[PDB]
């Protein structure tokens, strides 16, 4: 059993891989609030996500190298998925390019950031 997550903040979409989601699920079993840092390999950018106990994301921000804020986003939508299929169906309907749908479909494992088209 796994849980996939997709977060739309500003006009960007953020894909959260299952393994990370399970780590947050365990952390929130033991605490009330979680601040997770996510590394975007492709663009070499770092982002800090704040989750409540209900696993919605409260705030999204772009971080520097000393956990510093460069840009703040407004969370618009948070969506959860029980299997890869429902994730793929959402991706195909996402307002992204085929090159972005190709990336999200092949890399469930990594923190991925794509832009709205």
């Amino acid at each position, epitope marked *: 059993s796994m849980k996939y997550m997709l977060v739309k903040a500003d006009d960007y979409y953020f894909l959260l891989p299952p393994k990370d989601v399970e780590k947050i699920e365990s952390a929130l079993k033991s605490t009330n609030k979680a601040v997770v840092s996510f590394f975007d390999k492709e663009n070499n950018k770092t982002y800090e996500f704040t989750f409540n106990k209900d696993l919605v994301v409260t705030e999204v921000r772009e971080t520097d190298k000393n956990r510093g804020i460069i840009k703040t986003f407004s969370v618009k939508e948070v969506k959860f998925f029980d299997n890869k299929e429902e994730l*793929l169906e959402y991706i*195909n*309907d996402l307002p992204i390019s*085929n*090159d972005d*749908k190709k990336l999200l*479909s092949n890399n469930i494992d990594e923190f991925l950031v794509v832009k709205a088209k």
Partner: antibody
């Protein structure tokens, strides 16, 4: 392996409607990411993509064959149907169906193609 | 709409030569895809995602490129390599092919 075979008439009177049928095997158009598309090639000319359908029932068409293309799928029959209205001699070509995937926006496997001539 | 100019239109090379074909796109494209069509037969995927060999295609074939300039290469040209080659993009609808490149063997 994955096999795709196209079937349809070899002769179509002008202004009539061409109906092609792609019967595939080795995959399901119900599996997520899976897609099937149609591509044609007039005698001695370059390939032109025509249409495609996806597992989510999303359909895309070449804006050049406007108001003339319609595609559907029957996952039980494992086949895809393409309908082209108002057939014309410029549409005489070999018609090919092929598989696509959201994972790879390219046609990895093709059918043998069916030749269709528009003539009175 | 992404249009694609393939070059040369025709090419004659001896067996063992190194053949290079170029695809120039009308706009930036993430990946280029190459097909080989012998005459009367259906296209066969040769190189995918710009530089990836399809399964069962000889190592003699390779691809390179980025943005709007892409290339397909044959290290040692073999007699069976007679065909027309097509660069294809799936990065944006409508999907479009190149004009094709006819590769003839000189003997």
């Amino acid at each position: 392996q994955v096999t795709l075979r196209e079937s349809g008439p070899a002769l179509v009177k002008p202004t009539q409607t061409l109906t092609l049928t792609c019967t595939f095997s080795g995959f399901s158009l119900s599996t997520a990411g899976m897609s099937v598309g149609w591509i044609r090639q007039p005698p001695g000319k370059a390939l032109e993509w025509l249409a495609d359908i996806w597992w989510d029932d999303k359909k895309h068409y070449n804006p050049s064959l406007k108001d003339r293309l319609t595609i559907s799928k029957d996952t039980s029959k494992n086949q895809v149907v393409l309908k082209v209205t108002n057939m014309d001699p410029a549409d005489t070509a070999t018609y090919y169906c092929a598989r696509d995937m959201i994972f790879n926006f390219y046609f990895d496997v093709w059918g043998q193609g069916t030749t269709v001539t528009v003539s009175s | 709409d992404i249009q694609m100019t393939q070059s040369p239109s025709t090419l004659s090379a001896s067996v063992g030569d190194r053949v290079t074909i170029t695809c120039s796109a009308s706009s930036r494209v993430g990946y280029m895809h190459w097909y080989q069509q012998k005459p009367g037969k259906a296209p066969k995927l040769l190189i995918y995602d710009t530089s990836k060999l399809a399964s069962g295609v000889p190592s003699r074939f390779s691809g390179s490129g980025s943005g709007t300039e892409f290339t397909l290469t044959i290290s040692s040209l073999q007699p069976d390599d007679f065909a027309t080659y097509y660069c294809f993009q799936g990065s944006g609808y409508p999907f479009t092919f190149g004009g094709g490149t006819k590769v003839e063997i000189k003997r």
